[model samples]
Each structure stands twice: as C-alpha cells, then as structure tokens.
Target: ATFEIVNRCSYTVWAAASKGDAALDAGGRQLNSGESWTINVEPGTNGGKIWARTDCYFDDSGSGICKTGDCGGLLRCKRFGRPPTTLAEFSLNQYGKDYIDISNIKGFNVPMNFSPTTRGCRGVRCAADIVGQCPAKLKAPGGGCNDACTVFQTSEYCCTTGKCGPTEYSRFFKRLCPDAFSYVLDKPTTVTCPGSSNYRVTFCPTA
Candidate 1:
C-alpha cells in the first residue's frame, strides 16, 4: 500500500529509529517542506518505530534560527514512538495541516525514474565535434541547435559543440539568469559589473 504525507511546518523533517532499534536508525529517509514519501513495510516480526524531527533554518525575527514544531519554548517530537501497524487507521486530516502521514506500513514502492536532458554541456556531444564542424542549422549563434526549443534528433539535429540543443541552452541561460532575462528567445543586452572574473561576460536582457 501507499500513502501521502503533507508537511505543514516551515522546516524539513527526518525519520530515524526510536531508541535501541538499529533498523529505524539506519533508514535514511527525509521529507522536505510540502513533500511526500511512499514507504514500504511488511507483516513480520520486529516492527520499528518512526518519528519526525525539525531542521534548522534562518529566522527573520531576530531569534537566531528556528526549527519545525518549535512553539511555546518546547521541542516536542512531531511524533512519539509509534509502530507501523498503529498507522493503519491514521489519516492526514488528524494532524490538521502541519503533519506528514506515513501510513500503509506494508508493501510500499517509491518511483525514482526521471527524464534525461542535455543540460550544462559546454558545446560537445560526447567529445565528438566543436562549433565549426557542427552542422549548419545546428551551428552556434544563429543555428537550429542554437535556438532549438525541443528535443534534438540526430538527423534533424546539428551542433558542432555537441553540448546541447538550442532549446536546452536557452533554458539554462534563463534559469541561471532569471533577473537578467526572462526567457531564452529574448534579445539580451551587454552590461558591466565590478569584481568578476570576466566582466565582459555580464550581459542583460535589456540595457
């Protein structure tokens, strides 16, 4: 079975063993702000205890740092020692809106597969070619590969650097410099800054 956990606190929560049990201690599981996890368990002997703890984050109120579940000068455990079976009837709504429900203590599966993209590649596809030897449409500055907004096909694809398709480059630039430019296709302007390795490299979407 599977379940959804909602974190209503302002800090990250971690799961660890209760006391003398080593199984829960060795279980390296973590839940972040508003994140969920699907855990697996079995109907066998040696059921372990699970609990949540708050992580430290910068506090803007001049109180140094703050942790999750830290109210009224007390550091109460988000959850005390409880068995996985006890979670069978537990529901998320019980915790109001600041809890992570970890029910379904048996037969759980977490998906971890993801898509692949050519991100952060300088200008080479597996060290095959440079900007010059790349195809015309996929050439730098004003080529298909220069501004490709989608997946790259080996036949329709053309890139001398072999780093990434045009779309990927545009996405990377937009993400790393959102303040300078909003999107990849936008026209950028040159700008100057102080205390930098390459001052000339600093440019803006608009001057």
Candidate 2:
C-alpha cells in the first residue's frame, strides 16, 4: 500500500506508524509545517496505525520524546504511541479488503483527514478545535483532550467489558467529530475499500 502522511499544521509534526509490535516512514519522520513523507507499505500489514507526535525533540541519532505519542523514545516507532492521540489506522490487504478510520478514542491531539487517495472510499475527518473546546476534566497536561477513559478508568468510560454505552464525554467528542471513532463501539466512521487502496493522512486539516 502507498501511504502519505502530511503535516499542514502551523507547527511541526512527527508522523509515526506501527503494525503491532513490528514497524513500517518506516512512520517517525520529522515533518515541518509543509512537509510530508510517503512510504510504500510492506505487504500483509495488520493492526497498523499512523499517528502524529507533537512538541518533540530528537537528535541526529534519532532519540527524543514527544509531549504526546512517544513510542519508547525512538525516532521511528515500532509499536503504538502512548495515548492522547488522533489516529489514522489501517489494516491493508486483509482477506481481500482494506479498512481505515480516524480514531479519537484514545483522545484528540491534532485535527486530521484520513482518506484513501484512490476511491470513493469515504474518508474520516476530525478538523475541529477539540483541544480548545475540551472539557476541563479531560485535559492532558500540555495540550489535547484525553478521553474520559484515560481520565477516569471506570468501566463506564473504559468499556472494560464487552458491553458499553455512550457517555456525555463520548457524545461531546462525537458532536465535534462525528466521523471519528469517539468511543470503542463507534464504527460509524469506518471505511472499507479494496485491498489495493493507497491512502493519505493529513494532520491539522482545515476548518
């Protein structure tokens, strides 16, 4: 699959990708406000994700930490980033199908546009100023709005069991970005495309 993740924010962004415990920019590339990195993904990738890391500092040796979405302090992330994120997740070439979505279940950091570049695949966009409008209880230390699950660990928010329902927090998140997965059970925003689909994830998308 061909994947291109761009940074359109006024500030810098580090794009990272992980396929379970292994990796695929291979996704931790430093993208200035106008830069983007495209990578031809390896085949048969599952449990894969692409997310943005903010307020980061890395040396030439590829060592750094991000205020949000740091993965073991490596420039190139091999696993999932820590929470408080906006994810453009994918599982390609899976049994002749491809799935993609923008997930805010972990939380919201940057606005995003997650779309397949090749089809009527129906993209997902979360472009609102969620951070500015975040509930006070869900605020992360620096920026971004953490999910209620992160703030309160209760089953009502965490969905620890197989059964769960939308809470006020989830609803608020949904109202901001109806196309994103506000909670675990919300698949209303998922897109299914052919296995050959190529995609783009744009950070800090338009208003």
Per-model lDDT: 0.26, 0.87
- Pairs of residues clashing in candidate 2: none
Task: Report the number of the highest-lDDT candidate.
Answer: 2
Q: Kindly give the number of clashing pairs for every candidate.
A: 13, 0
Weakest ten-residue segment in model 2 by summed lDDT: 19-28
lDDT of 2 by residue, 126-188 (tens): 999999999999989967899999899998888889689999999999999998999988756
TM-scores for every candidate against the unseen true structure: 0.24, 0.95
Q: Which ten residues in a row have the lowest lDDT in candidate 1?
A: 196-205
lDDT of 1 by residue, 27-126 (tens): 3245665564444323221323343433433334422222322222222222232211111111112222111112211111110111111222111001
Q: Please identify model 1 stretches exceeding 4 Å from their true place.
A: 1-4, 17-20, 24-26, 45-47, 56-207
